[PDB]
Amino acid sequence: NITEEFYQSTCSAVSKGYLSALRTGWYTSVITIELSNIKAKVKLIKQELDKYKNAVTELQLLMQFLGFLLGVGSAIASGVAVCKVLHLEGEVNKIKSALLSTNKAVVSLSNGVSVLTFKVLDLKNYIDKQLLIETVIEFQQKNNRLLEITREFSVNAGVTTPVSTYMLTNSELLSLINDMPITNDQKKLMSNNVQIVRQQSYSIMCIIKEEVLAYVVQLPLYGVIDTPCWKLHTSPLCTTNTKEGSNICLTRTDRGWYCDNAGSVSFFPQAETCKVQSNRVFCDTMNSLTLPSEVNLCNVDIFNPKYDCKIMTSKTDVSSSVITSLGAIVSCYGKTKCTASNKNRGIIKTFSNGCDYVSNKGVDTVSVGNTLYYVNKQEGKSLYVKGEPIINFYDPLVFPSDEFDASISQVNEKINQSLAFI
Amino acid sequence: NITEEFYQSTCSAVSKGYLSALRTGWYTSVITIELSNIKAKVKLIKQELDKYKNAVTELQLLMQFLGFLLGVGSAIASGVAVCKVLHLEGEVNKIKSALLSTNKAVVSLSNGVSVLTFKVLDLKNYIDKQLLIETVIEFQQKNNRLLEITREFSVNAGVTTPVSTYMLTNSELLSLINDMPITNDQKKLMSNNVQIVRQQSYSIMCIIKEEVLAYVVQLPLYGVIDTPCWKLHTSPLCTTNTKEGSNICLTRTDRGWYCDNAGSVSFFPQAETCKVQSNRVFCDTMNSLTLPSEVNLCNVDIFNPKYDCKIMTSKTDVSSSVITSLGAIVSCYGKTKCTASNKNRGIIKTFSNGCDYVSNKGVDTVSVGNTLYYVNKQEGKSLYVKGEPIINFYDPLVFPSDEFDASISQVNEKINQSLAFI
Amino acid sequence: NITEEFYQSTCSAVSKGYLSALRTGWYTSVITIELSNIKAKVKLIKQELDKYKNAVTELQLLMQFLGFLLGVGSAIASGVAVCKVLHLEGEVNKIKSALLSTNKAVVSLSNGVSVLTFKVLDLKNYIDKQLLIETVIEFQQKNNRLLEITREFSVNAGVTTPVSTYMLTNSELLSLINDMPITNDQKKLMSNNVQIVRQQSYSIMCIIKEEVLAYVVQLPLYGVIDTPCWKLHTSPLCTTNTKEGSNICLTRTDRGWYCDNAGSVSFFPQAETCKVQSNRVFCDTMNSLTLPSEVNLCNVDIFNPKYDCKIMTSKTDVSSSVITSLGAIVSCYGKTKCTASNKNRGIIKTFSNGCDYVSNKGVDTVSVGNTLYYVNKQEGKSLYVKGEPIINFYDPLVFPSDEFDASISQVNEKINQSLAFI
């Protein structure tokens, strides 16, 4: 299921076996709260009603390495577009109308957007009936929900994420998912991962008008599902000569998540925009580059003539470890002490100067200098691919050593150039 | 009102029409909570009083591209300076004294700071009266506020932001703003944008002593208001030759917010330190550089002899889009599919290799590779300024291609140098 | 106690006098909540019981400059390893068993991990007794705690930090610390800084099975305590020639926290991974490099032959200030206005072009351009170390000016090279 290959020649490892779930688009729903325009166990409701009035008062005052290659989006542009529609005249009344005999209804907005509208709290109907037994309790439980939505919007300037359980309860989110217009695969994936959906959603406050509070919930559309994904971990590969500062180093800069998508590979350079759940990888295509699938060739052979593998160079031989999915890459240089230990037995391997790797089978921790790393202890097979470390192929006298946005061919050109002068 | 110019020659766009609101300084107020030193409907207050004692117990245990050019400040240095004063002897008693007959009072501290002090909760007076009818309810509502302030300080190590509605209610914040010593313009701007004020404020726990809990609220001073602001969006400008990796690229690195300020331009390289509300731009001068106004000349003519426009160079021709205020810049290179669509009609434009631009009029989404971008759908006019793309002016054989902290003149010097050798 | 030296020659300052508290490892405890499997003042408990059932329902659906040199760890790898054990059969029942006659017990898990288990809420025993007077109140207070833990896990995908006061109360955290297996020094340091401990902890949801909710709390182990620490502040050092863009600049890139640790120095390049409490510095060794102690020699003499001091170079002479522990470094260049003021007296010093420094004694604010900086007003002595600014030692005609990952020797080599050609 989950497997891993370490490449000794380029000091990198590839974890495969994952399945994708990529946010490719947004769904926008309009959540509504109908409000009231009002001015022994009684005095309980007295303050509960002052709380209500203030919440409305408060709401109305309110409504007055390679990541640099990414483009720049506007995350809530679609949601805010729907908000601007809800300010047109009659547009709020059109909604209030549709949600008259039911909580859930689909409405066609004037600019031609079909949206799932949803009345999750009907305070108006509640207040203008009872407040004009358990009815004290239920008012507090619904009022408290109103106060919390109010709290959230007024410390986040009307835009919140993840969408809290007060903005949209589980039972509400689940049925919203079900009433959505998506495939059965998408419905199940969202239903079985609602905490992730919550984290990739936005809650946007739109309007208070005509006794209605309206906010858009902006939900993720996963248009790519169950394609193969793999994570690339890289570490500095340096020479290990004796005289200090006479060493040269080289790191693959294309680390991150890689997912097959529509004939290409989606690449996510900041592997923190992606959230892994078991063997499923939730990513957002806004944080990706679209590369040719040939990019995968860089792991097998970094000198392949089909794709120009990206690297940076330096003279900075510092030690560090990279904790992978199924093991640990260790770059030990200079006088650093680098080890790996079993939980009960102690040190089992001492690393030499160079870049090496150890799997999580039998290993619980790795130490580099004064830094303790615990390794992920998930089941999976690791393969160690022996190979000559490519930094040995370069003459230090003509090596370009501050290249960052570089590649194999750019380094080869700089070398060929400075070598020709000689 | 909001307008936009795209510059085809340098692959950048400028959105203008915004008005500034820059945090230039801090106001520090001392919020107080008077506490009590104490050891049928009755048993309600019993646990409500145990909650109180613990909160106090708990509080006392508690009280035992170009962003790298920015300097480094200490955000709460002014607030903490006031805290250190409140530990001097008599200094707390001086406050307790002033707030004896009113909730709001201005006190002169011994080190010569005139501060707006504010007793927002008087538990002492409440407890040592009633707890020695609705009085169970009001105790819970004030106690709950105490527990929440306690919660916040003890997960944020005594420093919180944005300042929550428990630290300072709307009604309290509003009158605090009104009793403040600032201009009527500043008062209105803060009153009409209290959620933004909250986000730019700090809450700093100072002391528990002599039955008083004291925290400083650190509020923003907007010393620059209603000056013109404009946002600069830039994208990679590359050549589009057929043989891959034979292309050269160039990006303007001075993207961010620009605001006229006191004869100069304040420049905010990380356009996320700035929050836009309609056409108003809230920035913080701590995250800015002060540039000559001549920096604006880089948009009209990037080769102007008055200011040295900053760029970076590469060989990395990857596709990406930049979503602007009123449209979209698209950098399409290689085999990438780049389009723009109308919401109901589908693809309306297919982009060629190069850097191009489309406005948000008639356009709802832009696609680059596997990445869908929604465009901002705000009203405004866009102007497309036709011009020869400057990367065509360079000979690829003598082009410096890993420059990051570069500029037009630095690139010209490197070229002139390597050309002279030839 | 806290002291500071500014080095005029390299435009940097060192704040010393701090004591370390480094997170070197993790302790993992298993917090449990025993649940119930169930289907006048009465109707209070009715909804309180529906809340309970849902929380369980909801939980079960749920359970279906130099920072780039750092390695990459997996912060909760140890905690999650314990979670995977708690899914083995009998493993939950082994715990439920041990916590039968007490809230606190140490259990040996099957894979040989001795963990402090802790039953912080016994709803089962409570529900299956009473709910089959004040007992309405206590149920609400314990139920509310259950709902909040539920809230937190379901917006954070089961992993929370800082560990909230609902996950683990103060009284619980304190005794957990006391029952822990650590030194008396560690116990006192944690007890006296529980808000910091909270911030460096993780709460990981593990399992619902056999009427038990289990989450791991992952607590910090401070294996290095009371070693000397010092912070290095650096600023751009530029020449100040008249013709613009004819100037060369140089910045020490090794700014951050430095702490003596086990014969070496732990270096924290991102001085925000470290939290200072008075004169104590809480760091995490995962965000550090292990350097030779000789790295300290770079402050006294940057040209020392024992360690190769790291720098970057540019032509970008922009003004900025760096607020230190006890003063302010100012880099004033070009036409920028740079001053320092006393709180009541006004401007007291106007800075010249160059890099200069002023202490916090008599000084309250510093101004660079349109940017106001407040200085830290803590007691301590500053020493100004006069010295020739090293950028004057370089010939601008052969100066390498886009070096970022550079050093004194690398710059000297580039110079020696381009000078030999001449």
Ligand SMILES: O=C(c1cccnc1)N1CCN2C(=O)c3ccncc3[C@@]12c1ccc(Cl)cc1
């Ligand atoms: O980060 C900096 C930098 C510079 C000055 C002051 N503070 C930081 N630099 C300059 C050169 N650089 C590296 O060698 C490097 C390595 C890993 N991440 C970022 C960088 C980078 C860089 C960043 C973006 C691009 Cl397009 C190109 C290079």
